[PDB]
């Protein structure tokens, strides 16, 4: 929106976009902070 922003979507494995994958409750969680444009949605 108005900053680097941080990806926090959940996954079943560490995504190449979020090398820092957090497997919790069985799924994953991105903890990255970057925004070359603003948001992918």
């Amino acid at each position: 929106e108005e900053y680097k922003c941080y990806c926090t979507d959940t996954y079943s494995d560490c995504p190449g976009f979020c090398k820092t994958c957090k497997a919790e409750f069985g799924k994953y969680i991105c903890l990255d902070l970057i925004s070359p444009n603003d948001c992918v949605k």
Partner: peptide, 11 residues
């Protein structure tokens, strides 16, 4: 190609 769930509430 960040994730579809980008969080950026409050600059």
């Amino acid at each position: 190609t960040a994730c579809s769930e980008c969080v950026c509430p409050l600059r």
